[PDB]
Design a protein around this ligand. Structure first.
Ligand SMILES: C[As](C)(=O)[O-]
Ligand SMILES: C[As](C)(=O)[O-]
Ligand SMILES: [Ca+2]
Ligand SMILES: [Ca+2]
Lengths: 416, 416
């Protein structure tokens, strides 16, 4: 443990050490920090303490307004940074601990900081890799006999997302206007979305890219995965339904996608690795690898309506319900020579387990609005109402510590 | 006329004046230039001559390595820059013309210049707005009675593309590996794409963005359109067919998309405006505007195999065929609150007219591999072969001058 006091139930013990971009009232310039207890350690202030071989000539990466350049340095640099931070934050090491003037400049409170997006996301991709989610959607729209489309068990299906509208936790999300077709015998209409939904996801940031035209082999895929965040892929389902054949989700997704700000490095999550789900049929060789790379990350979603005094927990799930791994997603994404770049964000798709309490959208929880979701205090939902606030949280549970993700929150504003 | 001599068939008379980013052997810094005749005027060198009200405090935008900041300044700035350039390049003006020292440093031959991508593209979107293209694809894959899907005549269908693999003209494109399902009785296979295609498009760059959550009304859409380039959306059709239901084109597109480097400003194209195609049914009011915004731009595509000495013209088309205008595309793209940003690229979709000589893909020109494309010199094609070079060109034709785009070229390399 650390010289910084850490509560037992803190998301940010010395075993975590996530990376984020923050600013304060006194200094509005976005800069890189690491969460520890209820504090932020400012890496722009302590960049000269990274004296090892991988970082000593790259200390400027900690002075940037985004994590992109640090992400681009690759695994040796990340591992050295983490070892340096663990040694510096240890309760028995004197350097940062006993340098009072440095320490006063280096640490500020999380409760007084403003968080920003952790990276400039050049490209965002959303996969569809949770089998029960894809199955549930298939049942609802095609029937139980056509629950999965023919390609789903053969490749990690995904689409290009909209990068510009990825926003940091806490950003209000306006209910979108657009066109929809509620009656198939009549022309489409223009109006406010009536089926506004959340999608519980996680996403990973890419480290070093691959060269244009050069695939990343699955055996090297783990080298390019920096760390993870929580995501809410807000969805306008009536807009989506009318637009999306044949070229895919578009305006139904691109009005807003929220991510949490603290990027938990893969090294912090490796203690919580579990076996990959068995795949049948077995994937082609380029997607076949024996490295365990599925993670036991508890996820929870709450909803609170304006007026309501307390939030209701509407979903309890886990990131281990993903059939295609992050290694397979990254490999598939580059198999054609596509060039992944530092700070790219590859998301899981909606996470659903087989238990109905773990379904990751209100589309599934309400089963296409045929079941009312109990949100407490005599109130019910099918889809989101104006003023509803959705908060996603997640953590890995260790013995006496948690590796937590903070929150991924947003409140719905009325259409405009 | 300019003091720089311009050939009658030059793409770059004083009536054009497109913006691009170039470097030279002498100076490796990517920098902003304007094409005139066979020369480039370096805007960083003459940035102090922009003394008007819109540009006087924004001269640093011409020192940047990309056009994004200039694009973000908006129409008054673009109009002022253009007016200043037309004055400074005029045959009858002395300021630049008679300054031998400055001229020496301000001009460079295009033959000496390496072109770069003109902007950092935060998000690329590909629309699908040619009626004959969508109809042709519909006939080939669904049958003649089901040419168009139900939403096509009601909104400008489009999808999010991959930004990272947009490359400048001249970049070699490697035939992609991936997964394909050549027939339906066996499992999918891994191998080199067998059905590699080009797609003739044009694309426009966004100027000032809109705020997250705030739509751009169609009456203001023209304020956000900076200028245009040529595009080849290279397509791996067998990869695409297996992957694309239900989330849309993905690895079938993202291995490479080529654009030409010279951004022709909308002001150069306005003399060549024609009436918009009549729409029936009439679109919803948010997509309804009377401003002509369809452009008479001649387009040509050539193919040259690696053993050929003459390239064959395989497509002659025109941007005026497109059913949905750029105004409608930009309006639709932001109707849900999605935030377009300076330097975003919004492409037209494959441009096909009704004449079979104007079909914009080899998929259409070979009618799904059923007809041989004559490429001259005893040779035919259905789809692209290794070593084939595809070159797209375009121009508007005036009286004694043209507004042209230069080349949009790429050569196919063999798969790994
Ligand atoms: C791609 As979906 C069915 O999770 O909106
Ligand atoms: C979306 As297409 C049919 O022009 O590959
Ligand atoms: Ca999603
Ligand atoms: Ca295309």
């Amino acid at each position: 443990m650390s010289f910084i006091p850490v509560a037992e139930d803190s998301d940010f013990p010395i075993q975590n050490l996530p990376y984020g971009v923050f600013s304060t009232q006194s200094n509005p310039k976005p800069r890189i920090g690491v969460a520890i207890g209820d504090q932020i350690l400012d890496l722009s202030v302590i960049k000269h303490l990274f004296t090892g071989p991988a970082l000593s000539k790259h200390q400027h990466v900690f002075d940037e307004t985004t994590l992109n350049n640090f992400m681009g340095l690759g695994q040796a640099a990340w591992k050295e940074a983490r070892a340096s931070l663990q040694n510096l934050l240890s309760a028995s090491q004197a350097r940062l601990r006993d340098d009072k003037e440095l320490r006063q400049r280096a640490f500020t409170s999380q409760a007084s900081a403003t968080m920003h997006l952790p990276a400039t996301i050049g490209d965002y991709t959303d996969f569809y890799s949770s089998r029960q989610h894809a199955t549930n959607v298939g049942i609802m729209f095609r029937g139980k006999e056509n629950a999965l489309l023919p390609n789903w068990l053969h490749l990690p299906v995904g689409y290009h997302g909209r990068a510009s509208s990825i926003v940091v936790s806490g950003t209000p999300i306006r209910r979108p206007m657009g066109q929809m077709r509620p009656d198939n015998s009549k022309p489409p209409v223009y109006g406010a979305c009536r089926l506004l939904d959340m999608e519980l996801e996680m996403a990973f940031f890419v480290g070093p890219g691959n060269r244009f035209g050069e695939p990343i082999p699955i055996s090297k895929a783990h080298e390019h995965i920096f760390g993870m965040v929580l995501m809410n892929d807000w969805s306008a389902r009536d807009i989506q339904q009318w637009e999306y054949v044949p070229l895919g989700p578009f305006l139904g997704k691109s009005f807003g996608t929220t991510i949490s700000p603290w990027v938990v490095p893969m090294d912090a999550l490796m203690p919580f690795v579990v076996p990959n789900p068995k795949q049948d049929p077995k994937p082609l060789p380029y997607l076949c690898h024996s490295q365990p790379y599925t993670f036991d990350i508890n996820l929870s979603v709450s909803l609170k309506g304006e007026g309501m005094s307390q939030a209701a927990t509407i979903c309890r799930s886990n990131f281990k319900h993903m059939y295609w791994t992050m290694l397979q997603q990254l490999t598939h994404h580059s198999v054609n020579g596509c060039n992944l770049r530092p700070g790219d964000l590859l998301a899981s798709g909606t996470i659903s387990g087989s238990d109905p309490e773990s379904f990751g959208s209100m589309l599934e929880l309400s089963w296409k609005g045929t079941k009312a979701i109990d949100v407490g205090q005599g109130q019910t939902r099918t889809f989101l109402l104006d003023g509803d606030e959705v908060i996603i949280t997640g953590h890995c549970q260790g013995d006496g510590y948690r590796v937590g993700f903070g929150q991924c929150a947003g409140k719905v504003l009325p259409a405009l």
